[PDB]
Amino acid sequence: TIPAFFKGNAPYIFAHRGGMALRPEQTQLAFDYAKQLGVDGFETDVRLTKDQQLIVFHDATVDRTTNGSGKVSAHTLAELKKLDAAYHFKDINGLTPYRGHAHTAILTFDELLKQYPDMYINVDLKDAPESYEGSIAPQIMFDTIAENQAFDRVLVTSFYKEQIVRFNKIAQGSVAIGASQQEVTEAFLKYHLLGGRYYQPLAQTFQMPTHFKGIDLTSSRFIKWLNDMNIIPGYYGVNSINLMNDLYQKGAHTIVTDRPDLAQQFKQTIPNKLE
Ligand SMILES: O=P([O-])(O)O
């Protein structure tokens, strides 16, 4: 029943929002470029529309990344799809080279699964649990995963523990889920109480920053401790090849990078038999 999400012996490299540093975030121009650059999958976010259809989108409003205005929850999928999701992407020249071009449109989570059936999906449920969109999003998320037979290649996480709570009750543990911050805090507590005898019963991915308020979280003993706790350690914001090799040798299993170009370089270093 447990999903075999992690296969092989090489850590998965994810492009942050499809590789937002090089191409407009959440657009096909980004997913195509990152996939060409040799990434293992896409880190992404989902928002629910008025049609109750999940779209690949980060902000609650389309103002930052499109030519439109307003919340995604107030727009239809048809209205959202007339917008240019590359309208505000600027290169270092100051130009917007992808404004008005093809493949600059918003995508639904359904079309993302059908179009890239070989990529791993690390998806974030963004809508708050208190909201109306957040109540029905976990179910719609599972239905989309279920309709595309992608139980073993999608990782559903959230900043809110309750969204992971509500997705996991529907998914029956048939889809890998991210670890909440409260669950890790109470994992450390049951460790000190029960000694090293404790481990988490179900493996969950805990994605971390490489640094937080001056505190380095790349300690080899911390990564080893998490693995001994049966907590799968991962890191986002990894934008150098030496840090990628460092986390790979310490035991991290997921890497989210804004720079998908380094993924191809990382893969050349590792052997093909590990995959
Ligand atoms: O997609 P992120 O920016 O919420 O990690």
Author numbering: 36 to 310
The study reports:
We postulated that the actual ligand associated with His93 would most logically be a water molecule and that P2 was partially displacing the water due to the low pH and high phosphate concentration in the crystallization condition. The refined 2.4 Å structure showed a single dihydrogen phosphate ion (P1) located in the same position in the active site as was present in the initial, lower pH structure. However, the low occupancy phosphate (P2) is clearly replaced by a water molecule hydrogen bonded to His93 as illustrated by the Fo-Fc simulated annealing omit map. These data suggest His93 is hydrogen bonded to a water molecule in substrate-free LpgDΔN. The LpgDΔN structure lacks a divalent cation; however, Mn2+ is proposed to bind to the same three acidic residues as the Ca2+ of BsGlpQ. The release of glycerol allows water to enter the active site and His93 acts as general base that catalyzes the water addition to the cLPA intermediate to form the LpgD-LPA product complex.
